[PDB]
Ligand binder design. Structure first.
Ligand SMILES: Nc1ncnc2c1ncn2[C@@H]1O[C@H](COP(=O)(O)OP(=O)(O)OP(=O)(O)O)[C@@H](O)[C@H]1O
Ligand SMILES: Nc1ncnc2c1ncn2[C@@H]1O[C@H](COP(=O)(O)OP(=O)(O)O)[C@@H](O)[C@H]1O
Lengths: 518, 523
């Protein structure tokens, strides 16, 4: 039922899997020209929840539909278990021949852990002969095509070590657990009478942090199930269905949100729904400046730079590391990010801090371009020992000059107050230091539109009130603004069940005048 | 898994390149007793029956073993082959392991002949979970009769982690070092893996290919040769994604794009310190690099290959920013190929191999003394000296006296402070009147050469072609006192101004841009 249309996000995995597995089986005479000798053993491995067997079934559909030029047999290495001496043994030679009498073919082996476990002194002589003669079945009945052994498992070490030898089972395909999620939401709701809004589904996928595929459909089914709970609360404690129209179970804005809150669900995090219209301008500005310094976000017509470096400096309480920098990291996605802070350096024992400080830089060198994050450099410099500072400096210096790896750091004290070793590390004469500024008047004006007023009247003079709140908030930092918002929004809850107005507005207007934060 | 592995008949000593002295000595231990059974009984010989392979991974450690197994099994069918890998769900678990080893040796004696191959012994017999296994292993290996006919072959990546009771003649008597191949062996490997190809590349093409590949080991060559073909195939037929096998041949521009898409094995785990001087900066420092190697032959006359040398030392001193320890030193290390290098730096003493820093220093000193000639490399000595405790300073200073006088071990060091500034103990190692101290410096011509094919040609890919010369003179005059980091920055700030004007077909709206930028640029 799936022909590469119920798969979301896997734009690059498909190209690799088809080119090195199916195409050599789809076009075997081509590789006779150069003698590539493609491997005869392939695997699907990764964390659970990646949907490994469905890909094999899709390959079966692709190969079977047509002229039957390449085939596929579906097999499981966990239901192929026979409690007899050698009866499950014939399954592979017949299968490696049944798929060979009608070759080419791809044979899937789900959970080979049971059919071919680790033969040992505790395992049955049955399974001992099974595994021995079984590896004899595969390494002997291969090496000329056109059978490519594809298997799946949850753990890589759950395989008999004699299987993974030269000239035997070799290849491994990494399946991992957000760009896939838009495609997933598009696909899995292909036939829905209450078709949700595209922004509705995008918010759904945004709020489904940590889910991998199956639970993505599970939440949708659960949302429908609780929709018929909420629209029809009388389903409990009622007689047989007498009059129920099964069309008012339509999913609206609040249905999935009440559905999401009924189960438990990196230094990059976008702003909240309340914070976005306050710092979005500054995030865009810093992104633009970074574009200017860092062009990656002999021969010409190729981007090049000289040691990408940048420092965020702002007065404490300006949210330069509390809200800005993780947001910038989130905005500059599709690049590897690697932090270096105290709980990641001292948070693991059985290792010297020097032992991990080299691994991050080495592996970020491997995957250039990469991002290294060092928050609160003004305090991180005074916690490490004398050797760590020197090791950090030498590791940073050993980078190539034209390597497009960016150093991102944030600070609280002004640049002129830092230790001198930091000072002769940034080039303020260049574009390497960015300043954070207080929000302007429009942002503060638009920060209070929702509560004043789009929900208070939900079942004048307050406008003067409104401007007074702004008339005092010219020079308050982010934390004071947000705490003020929370304290005002509390009173709105305080009189939910008071239809009579002019008494709640009195208490709001007297609390705002009473709010002293000098 | 005691069954022999069905090896291909295509590996018959014709797929091994540059390993000739090793094969020339291996065949007189295995083959000759069997093929000349009368000459070993002329008087008495009893040839040996065991050898160790040690060295970095990826140097054809197993390929020679498979080739030996196949080539031997030709006139004495069948020579048995047994393949076991160390640390394979068998260690740290007793007492099944001794039963397994005894069974393997019994069946091997039953076969007669056989070749037993223990791979990665480092995890089997470490330097009564572990005592009982090593004891029975060595008792069994001593219980082998002299004529055998059992030959035991061990492989490892580090020699330091083996029992000292095994390296005795009678168990593991002869040791073999498998180092990286040099340029000649690299060309030989290229010729071997490109044998069944009808568009045979030219010899000069192979020479330049061999020169363009440094720090590579066997598998890198295989991957590059196997993926350049896929690059050509991908480029030829993009409409097929019946097929025509007529024009899928490989050409240039396919080898270099192949070079782009992965990293060498040396940048993965080996982490070699020597790194080739960049093509952008080459015409700025090539003369200096050639000059240093000229002054290196005064003290270490092995570099021009009864060569007698006495304590070869060298130290290149300069200003903080002249690129001593950033560009020059890895280049000089690079040009001295065929000499093994061992590194002594902060990341190596401390991060890797978390034991006392007192151990790795002794290990690298002894290993360097064992395989002379070699280079011991300790850069940034004015910072290295002030991080270590007095114990390691004493250890290091005393280990440099135990080398024999005429042993060819070169010490390479770099520094930023002037000679008289360094602490007096370090000063009591370099004897400048002997010629052990080099001073580095920053000409008009060399930077002129650095600039013209950026400010003339790359900016000409309507053009005035007159004020470019004046701009070149102005900027060159302006750059009379910058250091290397600054000088290589102006190149990156002008080319970016060019990139920002990619589609500007009029090359006049940008001229004033540079004629203002170079005056708004400051050191
Ligand atoms: N990434 C995914 N995309 C789509 N459907 C998925 C995904 N992951 C899981 N599913 C669905 O949930 C089911 C559970 O997956 P499955 O049990 O095969 O994986 P597993 O956790 O490795 O377990 P096991 O190997 O024991 O079967 C799948 O059969 C499929 O219906
Ligand atoms: N000299 C060589 N000639 C041809 N191939 C080589 C050579 N050295 C290494 N290889 C490649 O390396 C692989 C074997 O590496 P191996 O010697 O097993 O390294 P290790 O023993 O450290 O795993 C082979 O697949 C082969 O293609």
């Amino acid at each position: 039922s799936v022909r590469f249309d119920s798969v979301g996000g896997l734009s690059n995995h498909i190209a690799a899997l088809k080119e090195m597995v199916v195409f050599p089986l789809l076009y075997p005479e081509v590789f006779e020209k150069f003698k590539i000798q493609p491997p005869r053993g392939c695997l699907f491995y990764g964390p659970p929840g990646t949907g490994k067997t469905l890909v094999a079934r899709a390959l079966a559909n692709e190969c079977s539909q047509g002229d039957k030029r390449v085939a596929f047999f579906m097999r499981k290495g966990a239901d192929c278990l026979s409690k007899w001496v050698g009866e499950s043994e014939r399954q592979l030679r017949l299968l490696f021949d049944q798929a060979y009498q009608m070759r080419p073919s791809i044979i899937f082996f789900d959970q080979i852990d049971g059919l071919a476990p680790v033969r040992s002194s505790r395992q049955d002589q049955i399974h001992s002969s099974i595994v021995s003669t079984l590896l004899a079945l595969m390494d002997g009945l291969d090496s000329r095509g056109e059978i490519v052994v594809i298997g799946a498992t949850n753990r890589l070490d759950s395989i008999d070590p004699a299987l993974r030898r030269p000239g035997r089972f070799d290849r491994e395909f990494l399946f991992s657990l957000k760009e896939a999620r838009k495609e997933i939401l598009k696909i899995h709701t292909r036939d829905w009478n209450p078709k949700p809004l595209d922004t509705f589904l995008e918010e759904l996928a945004e709020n489904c942090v940590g889910y991998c595929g199956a639970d993505i459909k599970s939440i949708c089914a659960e949302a429908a199930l609780c929709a018929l709970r909420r629209r029809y609360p009388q389903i409990y404690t009622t007689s047989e269905k007498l009059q129920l129209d099964l069309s008012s179970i339509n999913i609206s804005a609040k249905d999935f949100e009440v559905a999401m809150q009924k189960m438990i669900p990196s230094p990059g995090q976008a702003l909240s729904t309340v914070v976005k219209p306050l710092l979005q301008n500054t995030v865009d500005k810093i992104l633009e400046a970074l574009q200017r310094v860092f062009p990656h976000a002999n021969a010409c017509y190729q981007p090049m730079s000289f040691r990408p470096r940048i420092l965020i400096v702002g007065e404490p309480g300006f949210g330069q590391g509390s809200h800005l920098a993780p947001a910038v990291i989130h905005a500059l996605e599709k690049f590897t990010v690697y932090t270096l802070d105290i709980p990641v350096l001292f948070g693991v024992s059985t290792t010297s801090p020097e032992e991990t400080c080299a691994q991050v830089i080495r592996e970020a060198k491997r995957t250039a371009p990469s991002i290294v994050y060092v928050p609160h450099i003004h305090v991180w410099w005074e916690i490490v020992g004398p050797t760590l500072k020197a090791t950090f400096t030498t590791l940073l210096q050993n980078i190539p000059s034209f390597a497009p790896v960016l150093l991102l750091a944030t600070s609280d004290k002004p640049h002129s107050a830092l230790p001198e070793e930091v000072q002769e590390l940034f080039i303020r004469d260049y574009g390497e230091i960015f300043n954070v500024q207080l929000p302007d008047k429009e942002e503060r004006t638009k920060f209070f539109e929702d509560l004043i007023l789009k929900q208070a009247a939900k079942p004048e003079r307050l406008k003067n009130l409104l401007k007074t709140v702004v008339k005092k908030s010219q020079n308050y930092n982010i934390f004071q603004l947000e705490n003020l918002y929370a304290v005002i929004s509390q009173c709105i809850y305080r009189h939910r069940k008071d239809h009579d107005k002019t008494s709640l507005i009195q208490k709001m207007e007297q609390e705002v005048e009473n709010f002293s934060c000098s």
